[PDB]
């Protein structure tokens, strides 16, 4: 059938498998009738933009262990029906902003075993239908604030084996774990990485009181105190000096004119 790639194996229902075929790139001739695609254990190092064009009705895409190290922003254009992504076990060091924006139906996005040093808020984009994420075995030193702020339906997350430097930059992170209790088996495996006073400390053991020193958001009392502290202090110092000088002058005058003869 024309809807099946010549080198891949297809079964009725739109399920296609292309794994263990040593494909150097995405096979050509994608069709709309395929719903699930397998591409793992291949050698697709570079992903061309619009590579998956034609299979707009695809639902599951697998790219685990495929040597991925650079993904174009528009490579996943038109894959609005795609739901499952397995990008894990690759060498993705950075994700261009807007790459995953068209993926409105995404539910699982796997980035495990990658060299992603930092994940930025603009990288994930708008993902309302996303239910879970997997970020284990990555070099994510800290999650930038507001990344989880566009993932309303995120209920499962994996964070083991990461260089989590436990400080104020991950305060938005642990705030999730407090309202999403990580199961104990996985909770025991998520630990701070920085060798300071916080090693072997689970991320769920850090409460608000431990990070009260962390920058609290700008209030309305302090806003006014910081503006007024300068001029008020200067005026107080000036008045204190004036009062001291006036008092000393008056005391010396009353000692001098009342004892002029003596």
């Amino acid at each position: 059938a024309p809807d099946c790639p010549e080198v891949c194996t297809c079964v009725p229902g739109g399920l296609a498998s292309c794994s263990a075929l040593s494909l150097p790139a995405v096979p050509p001739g994608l069709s709309l009738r395929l719903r699930a695609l397998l591409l793992d254990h291949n050698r697709v190092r570079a992903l061309p933009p619009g590579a998956f064009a034609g299979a707009g009705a695809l639902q599951r895409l697998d790219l685990r262990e495929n040597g991925l190290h650079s993904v174009h922003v528009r490579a996943f254009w038109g894959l609005g029906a795609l739901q499952l992504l397995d990008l894990s076990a690759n060498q993705l060091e950075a994700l261009a902003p807007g790459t995953f924006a068209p993926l409105r139906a995404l539910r699982n996005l796997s980035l495990a075993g990658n060299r992603l040093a930092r994940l930025e808020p603009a990288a994930l984009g708008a993902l309302p239908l996303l239910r879970s994420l997997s970020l284990q075995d990555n070099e994510l030193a800290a999650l930038a604030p507001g990344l989880l702020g566009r993932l309303p339906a995120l209920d499962a997350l994996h964070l083991r084996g990461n260089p989590w430097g436990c400080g104020c930059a991950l305060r938005p992170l642990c705030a999730w774990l407090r309202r999403h209790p990580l199961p104990a088996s996985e909770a025991e495996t998520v630990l701070c990485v920085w060798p300071g006073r916080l090693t072997l400390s689970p991320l769920t053991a850090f409460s608000d009181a431990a990070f009260s020193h962390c920058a609290q958001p700008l209030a309305l009392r302090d806003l006014a105190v910081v503006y007024t502290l300068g001029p008020a202090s200067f005026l107080v110092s000036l008045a204190s000096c004036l009062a001291l000088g006036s008092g000393l002058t008056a005391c010396r005058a009353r000692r001098r004119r009342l004892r002029t003869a003596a």
Binding site: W194, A215, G230, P231, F234, S240, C241
Partner: protein, 882 residues
């Protein structure tokens, strides 16, 4: 915990500082606009209190000023320490030590700002000062940080600008007074403060990347690296290993180059120059025991110092270690320093003024053996130089009357002024060489016997023996110039029956020539004045033991004459009979200086001379100049004056120039033009005019002597000679023949005068006729020669012996004309008639077998015993009275 910095809030501190500054500005401007649009004063009293406090006018003020200095340095150190910490951090106030010290420091700075504002005259312009601005942007942020328990290293680098007010602090404390130190501290403070502040701003901007890039341009430069970067930048080097990469950092670099490269290039050389101000030749001289030291001051210059050193330290004198200490205000140049280097262990130089008693005590004139004051002979104003010299000597006398002084005076009357100094103790020791007086005495002596001035001058310059292979006149002349004038104490063998008869004829045994008082040809413990060639063999005498006259009668005197009774004209001058007389050509103008001709006419009128044998003197030249000098030239006999000029042939024809005994060319306007080329041009013209005249015979053989201010002109006097600028004056043919004279040959007198003080007064009794303690006293008090009726003791004061020129062709000495033994000749002169001959006056071409028409004769001083003679010869002698 750590990693306390997630979201930035530098706007807190920055806005606090900005609102403080702008609110102050706006309230002051509002008060100004309101004022525009409408006891003794307690406000003025508190303003005065604050003004006294800010200045170091009370102990409290000085304490506060020192505290401001110290705490400014402390706040800078606090910033340096904090620079290592990250840009933003969280720290606890009551668990940290740096924050508390910083809080105390800025509280003090706030109080000081309050005091400064109270004392300020204009409030608006005080608000805009750099000190006030750095106060507005340094204290409020620390207060805010204490409030928030959060530290941002923001504008803290502005603390370095507090370093600028260090010159004012020191000037208040009276530490910084002189202009150079104030300027140096100003430059250093401005340079260091600007350097550190620019480095701090670059550190802040590079570490905290530009905001519009979301702070993604962190370069992480240490503060030391930014200091190094600014140093490389404003030095124009620009290595490029370190540089600014952010947009704001590059913008600051662009706008800082324009104002900072100029600052570096204008401040660094000036700072180096200011630090380089030092006194190289300072300090004092250490007086070493057992070795006397003399001090030399006055006109100190390369040529004068070199001449004095080469004559003073000559190997001819005995093994004496006298150390010379020079004292001059002007620091020596490279050539003079090299000359001092070549005499490293013998001389020292100390920069100072002889007027200041400090510098006199520095060279230790308290223990000095003598003080020698050189004079600038070649000055445009003799009066000024004599005046400066009398100041120098009076200052030395003021510090120490007991010191002995040798000095040069360009005029004779200033010598009389020197006698007016109370501590002119000439008895134990004191000297004053008058260059004009001695020069004119030498000229008059040469007038009596030609070429005597040359040998007199050569006796005093220290000359080592020199030999030339060729047979020339120079070969014999150099055998005579090597004889110097020495003094030696007599032996115990000659102190027996009588000094005189033992003195004569014994010069064969001692191989030296002898010339309680001054003794010249003693006929009829004493110091013998020897003419030995060296001081090594002078130690062979003692060691080896087998109304007509004046008030004194020393000179001649006659009734005063009026200038009109002696002024003549060509007609009567030609009518008047004159032969074997003296003619003196004088050059002068209206504004010319005063020579002083009295020391020229006095030597020719000693008592050993008879009125018939007295030589007539006629001065030819301008009448105004002789009028100016007439006040002293009117008590004089047998002197004539011819107006006109020596450059007119007829005027010289009238005065019988062809048969005169001596023509003396003198100039007075030589002190006006300072041009080396133009000097003595009138004298050279006059001398050549004399030489080119003709008489019903050429005048080139007329005996003429010219006094030249410039030595280099000696080459123009004679034409049949070799002219080399390299050779010295004593080697020149006109000088060796006694026809040229300059004061430059008298400078050696000091070197002689110090080493034996008698010689100078011996000069005064060997030239100029005679000078007694009395005649000097009379000249000092009256300054006019007067006479009286003769007395037997006055006439007895005439036993003296004066120089004479004896021929050789006719006389009892004809047998010795070519005897070949000059020693036999003078031994005969001594036994037969008690006459001593200094030496020989010999024709220039006599040594050559071929005859010639030359007439010039040179001088030989003390020929050896085995000296061949020529019948055409002249003899110097010391004839006795009759």
């Amino acid at each position: 915990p750590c990693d306390s910095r997630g979201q930035r809030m530098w706007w807190a501190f920055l806005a606090s500082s900005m609102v403080t500054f702008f609110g102050g500005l706006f309230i002051i401007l509002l008060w100004r606009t309101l004022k525009y649009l409408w006891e003794v004063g307690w406000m003025t009293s508190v303003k005065d209190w604050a003004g006294v406090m800010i200045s170091a006018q009370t102990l409290t003020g000085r304490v506060l000023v020192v505290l401001v200095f110290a705490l400014s340095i402390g706040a800078l150190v606090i910033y340096f320490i904090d620079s290592s910490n990250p840009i933003e951090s969280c720290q606890n106030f009551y668990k940290d030590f740096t924050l508390q010290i910083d809080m105390a420091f800025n509280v003090f700075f706030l109080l000081y700002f309050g005091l400064r504002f109270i004392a300020a005259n204009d409030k608006l312009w005080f608000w805009l000062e750099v000190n006030s601005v750095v106060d507005f942007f340094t204290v409020p942020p620390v207060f805010v940080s204490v409030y928030l328990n959060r530290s941002w290293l923001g504008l803290r680098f502005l603390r370095a600008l507090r370093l600028i007010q260090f010159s004012e602090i020191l000037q208040f404390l009276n530490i910084l007074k002189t202009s150079n130190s104030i300027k140096l501290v100003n430059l250093l403070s401005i340079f260091i403060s600007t350097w550190l502040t620019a480095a701090g701003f670059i550190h802040l901007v590079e570490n905290s990347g530009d905001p519009w890039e979301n702070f993604q341009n962190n370069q992480a430069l240490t503060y030391w690296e930014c200091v190094y970067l600014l140093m490389v930048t404003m030095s124009t080097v620009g290595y490029g290993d370190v540089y600014a990469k952010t947009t704001l950092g590059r913008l600051f670099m662009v706008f800082f180059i324009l104002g900072g490269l100029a600052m570096f290039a204008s401040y660094v050389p000036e700072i180096i120059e200011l630090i380089g101000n030092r006194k190289k030749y300072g300090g004092s001289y250490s007086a070493v025991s057992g070795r006397k030291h003399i001090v030399v001051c006055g006109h100190i210059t390369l040529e004068s110092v070199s001449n004095f050193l080469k004559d003073f330290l000559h190997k001819d004198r005995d093994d004496v270690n006298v150390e010379i200490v020079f004292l001059h205000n002007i620091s020596p140049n490279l050539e003079l320093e090299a000359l001092f280097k070549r005499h490293f262990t013998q001389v020292e130089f100390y920069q100072g003024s002889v007027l200041n008693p400090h510098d006199l005590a520095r060279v230790k004139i308290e223990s000095a053996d003598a003080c020698l004051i050189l004079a600038n002979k070649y000055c445009a104003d003799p009066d000024a130089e004599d005046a400066s010299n009398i100041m120098r000597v009076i200052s030395i006398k003021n510090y120490h009357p007991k010191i002995r002084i040798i000095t040069q005076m360009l005029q004779y009357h200033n010598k009389a002024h020197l006698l007016n100094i109370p501590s002119w103790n000439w008895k134990e020791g004191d000297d004053a060489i008058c260059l004009a007086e001695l020069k004119l005495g030498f000229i008059a002596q040469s007038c009596l016997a030609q070429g005597l001035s040359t040998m007199l001058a050569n006796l005093f310059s220290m000359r080592s023996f020199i030999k030339i292979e060729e047979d020339t006149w120079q070969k014999y002349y150099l055998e005579g110039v090597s004889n110097e004038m020495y003094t030696e104490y007599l032996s115990s063998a000659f102190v027996g029956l009588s000094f005189p008869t033992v003195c004569e004829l014994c010069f064969v045994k001692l191989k030296l020539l002898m010339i309680s008082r001054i003794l010249i040809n003693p006929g009829n413990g004493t110091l013998g004045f020897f003419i030995a060639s060296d001081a090594k063999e002078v130690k062979r005498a003692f060691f080896y033991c087998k109304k007509k006259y004046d008030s004194t009668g020393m000179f001649h005197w006659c009734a005063p004459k009026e200038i009109e009774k002696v002024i003549l004209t060509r007609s009567e001058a030609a009518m008047t009979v004159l032969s074997g007389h003296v003619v003196v050509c004088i050059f002068g103008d209206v504004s010319s200086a005063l020579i002083g001709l009295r020391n020229l006419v006095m030597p020719l009128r000693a008592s050993n001379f008879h009125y018939h044998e007295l030589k007539h003197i006629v001065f030819v030249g301008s009448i105004e100049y002789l009028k100016r000098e007439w006040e002293t030239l009117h008590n004089f006999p047998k002197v004539s004056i011819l107006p006109g000029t020596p450059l007119s042939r007829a005027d010289l024809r009238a005065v019988n120039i062809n048969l005169c005994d001596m023509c003396v060319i003198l100039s007075a306007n030589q002190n006006n033009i300072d041009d080396t080329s133009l000097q003595d041009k009138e004298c050279i013209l006059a001398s050549l005019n004399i030489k080119s005249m003709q008489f019903d015979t050429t005048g080139v053989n007329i005996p003429i002597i010219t006094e030249l201010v410039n030595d280099t002109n000696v080459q123009f006097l004679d034409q049949d000679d070799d002219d080399d600028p390299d050779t010295e004056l004593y080697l020149t043919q006109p000088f060796a023949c006694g026809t040229a004279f300059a004061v430059s040959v008298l400078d050696s007198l000091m070197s002689a005068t110090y080493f034996n003080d008698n010689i100078l007064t011996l000069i005064r009794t060997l030239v100029t006729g005679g000078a007694t303690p009395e005649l000097e006293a009379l000249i000092a008090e009256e300054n006019a020669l007067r006479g009286g009726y003769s007395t037997p003791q006055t006439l007895a004061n005439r036993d003296r012996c004066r120089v004479a020129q004896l021929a050789l062709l006719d006389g009892p000495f004809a047998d010795l004309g070519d005897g070949g033994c000059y020693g036999d000749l003078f031994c005969k002169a001594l036994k037969t008639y008690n006459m001593l001959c200094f030496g020989i006056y010999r024709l220039r071409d006599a040594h050559l077998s071929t005859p010639s028409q030359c007439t010039k004769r040179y001088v030989i001083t003390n020929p050896p015993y085995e000296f061949e003679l020529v019948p055409t010869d002249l003899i110097f002698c010391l004839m006795q009275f009759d």
